[PDB]
């Protein structure tokens, strides 16, 4: 149901701050936060575990807190794996369902279909301990896929699998939830899974949330200059700047463009110190089209020596420090300062250090 987490907080002899937000039914939500940022603790709390300290949580219109974890019909896939060592995998998958409607003419098909889904149907003999990581993970995930509860709570559910297994699980994990079944709280810091699956993503840091938008409203218009420099693993590099509205600045350069976005920046008294926030995916090599049909694309890149290959398209360690730009595969460069680039000066994230709310979009 509509899980309304109104001002939740845990403490320790400090782990989450006021988590005021809601999660409607049917839609996803994907937490993401650097490392130890009240993330698995939020799931432990919204489950029956980790009794709250602030004093509010409402699964649906109810007032369900300090209640037994059993009476909240919530499934879970922990960061760790329970994976009861004495049972086999058949029983590990049938456990949460056999404490439910019993008839054995149901489990016999259920623990077979939900094991062919995760590609395990051939491995229904061994017991945990005789299984590798990419199999224990799948079994732990199946133990919550098989439940069909009123809420799926997957906590880093697919961490160590291969690429094609991951791209098939990301398919059959939403091709399953789309029928019905949950307001799921997915947890992952993968930067592709939080963009292809969630209907509403959530970035957080040390408890406090930052942005609760959609997987595109964050890549395009990020607020508070941290989700800005966080999502998009080749993180948006940050050049300094001066106030100078019309032509703002560059580390080596001042001429800029796009007055079509200063109509609202007109009303600003922000400190003159300004971060310009250019994402690397917007840069090209000027030896391709000079940016656009218009030759002028601010040919500025000079010093690049660390050209990491990465196959599909390579990364130049752009230095005017320690910036990164990405150029295409056929780019004829190998540790040579002949890579005068072309940035796109119609889209970029002006910012400042104090409040960093320079989103100024929509």
């Amino acid at each position: 149901a509509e899980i309304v987490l109104d001002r939740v907080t845990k403490s320790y002899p400090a782990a989450v701050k006021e988590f005021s937000m809601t999660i409607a039914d049917g839609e996803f939500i994907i937490l993401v936060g650097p490392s130890g940022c009240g993330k698995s603790t939020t799931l432990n709390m919204i489950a029956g575990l980790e009794e709250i300290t602030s004093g509010e949580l409402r699964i649906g219109g109810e007032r369900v807190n300090e209640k037994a974890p059993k009476d909240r019909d919530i499934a879970m896939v922990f960061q760790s794996y329970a994976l009861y060592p004495h049972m086999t995998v058949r029983q590990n998958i049938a456990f949460p369902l056999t404490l439910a409607k019993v008839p054995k003419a149901e489990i016999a098909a259920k623990v077979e279909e939900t094991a062919k889904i995760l590609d395990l149907s051939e491995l229904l003999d061994r017991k945990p301990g005789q299984l590798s990581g990419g199999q224990r993970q799948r079994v732990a995930m199946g133990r919550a896929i098989v439940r069909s509860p009123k809420a799926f709570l997957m906590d880093q559910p697919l961490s160590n699998l291969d690429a094609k297994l991951r791209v098939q699980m990301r398919a059959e994990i939403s091709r399953l939830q789309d029928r019905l079944g949950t307001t799921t709280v997915y947890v992952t810091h993968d930067q592709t899974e939080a963009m292809t699956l969630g209907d509403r993503v959530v970035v957080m840091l040390a408890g406090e949330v930052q942005q609760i938008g959609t997987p595109d409203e964050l890549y395009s218009s990020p607020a508070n200059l941290f989700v800005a420099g966080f999502i998009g693993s080749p993180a948006m590099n940050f050049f300094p700047a001066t106030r100078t509205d019309v032509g703002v600045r560059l580390p080596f350069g001042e001429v800029t463009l796009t007055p079509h976005m200063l109509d609202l920046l007109d009303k600003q008294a922000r400190p003159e110190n300004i971060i310009v926030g250019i994402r690397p995916e917007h840069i090209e090599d000027s030896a391709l089209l000079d940016g656009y049909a218009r030759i002028r694309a601010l040919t500025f890149s000079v010093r690049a020596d660390i050209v990491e290959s990465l196959g599909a398209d390579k990364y130049v360690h752009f230095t005017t420090n320690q910036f990164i730009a990405r150029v295409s595969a056929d780019s004829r460069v190998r540790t040579g300062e002949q890579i005068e680039l072309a940035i796109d000066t119609t889209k970029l994230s002006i910012f400042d250090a104090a409040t960093g709310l320079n989103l100024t979009r929509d």
């Binding site: 575990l49 037994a68 329970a82 009861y84 004495h86 456990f95 133990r143 439940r147």
Partner: protein
């Protein structure tokens, strides 16, 4: 290497244990079987020679031993069976506590250190018509010690109360091993407070009950103290250990006391075999 480098260590590691266990117990066992091989009486020493299995065939062909056997067995299989079911609850209260910081955790363990004679006289005085804190609670002139079945009831109660801190300690020590994430996932997977047990917490300690279900049903099989000090043989209630004490110490019939000791060594070894075979996972495997 590792094969040699582990057994060369293990032999010198188990050397003192088995060495000491064979230095002062091999010859006594051999002598206790030798005394069975042939009639022997301490009242007339060296007045005897080899006789064979006469002692065995005469102890198996009486009625005074099957009676002392169908009582010790009927007491063991009802004392340990209730002791386990009560020790589970006692260990749970002893482990899931919030105040049991030595408050209950040791008040549940002092009733095991009380010496057996000073703790059997307590029950013998407790149940006497006229004298005893509870014997007066019964109706006028009750005396539940002269008749058979109430005597068996009180002799099994004086064993339950005595040895409950022996299987209410192993089912706790071997229970503090169960990791928290397992019980946590059992909790979140739709399992109450009982369905958790026998499903996720019990099959883990399955090698921790094999020590509290195999080192009790030996001692509670050779029950001698709480049945001799407490009505030691009235109306055919003597155990088998009292029958091995009477015919050996207070009769000097060594050639038969040794046979009656071996005849319960065998009958308890069959129980140990059945227990090791029924549990699978055990001490060696």
């Amino acid at each position: 290497d590792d094969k040699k480098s582990e057994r060369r260590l293990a032999f010198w590691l188990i050397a003192p244990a088995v060495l000491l266990m064979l230095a002062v117990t091999a010859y006594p066992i051999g002598y206790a079987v030798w005394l069975s091989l042939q009639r022997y009486n301490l009242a007339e020493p060296h007045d005897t020679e080899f006789i064979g299995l006469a002692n065995y065939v005469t102890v198996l062909t009486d009625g005074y031993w099957w009676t002392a056997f169908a009582v010790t067995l009927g007491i063991t299989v009802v004392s340990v069976a209730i002791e386990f079911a009560l020790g589970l609850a006692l260990a749970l209260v002893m482990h899931r506590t919030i105040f049991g910081k030595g408050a209950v955790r040791t008040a549940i363990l002092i009733p095991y250190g009380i010496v057996t004679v000073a703790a059997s006289y307590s029950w013998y005085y407790a149940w006497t018509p006229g004298t005893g804190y509870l014997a007066n609670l019964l109706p006028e002139g009750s005396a539940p010690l002269t008749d058979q079945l109430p005597s068996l009831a009180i002799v099994v109660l004086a064993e339950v109360w005595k040895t409950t801190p022996f299987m209410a300690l192993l089912l706790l020590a071997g229970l503090a091993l169960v990791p928290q994430d397992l019980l946590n996932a059992a909790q979140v997977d739709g399992a109450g407070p009982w369905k958790r047990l026998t499903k996720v917490i019990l099959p883990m300690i399955k090698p921790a009950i094999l020590v509290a279900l195999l080192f009790r049903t030996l001692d509670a099989f050779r029950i001698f103290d709480n049945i001799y000090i407490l009505t030691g043989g009235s109306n055919d209630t003597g155990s088998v250990s009292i029958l091995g004490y009477d015919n050996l110490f207070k009769a000097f019939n060594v050639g038969l006391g040794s046979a009656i000791s071996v005849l319960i060594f065998l009958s308890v070894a069959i129980i140990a075999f059945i227990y090791i075979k029924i549990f699978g996972a055990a001490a060696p495997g």
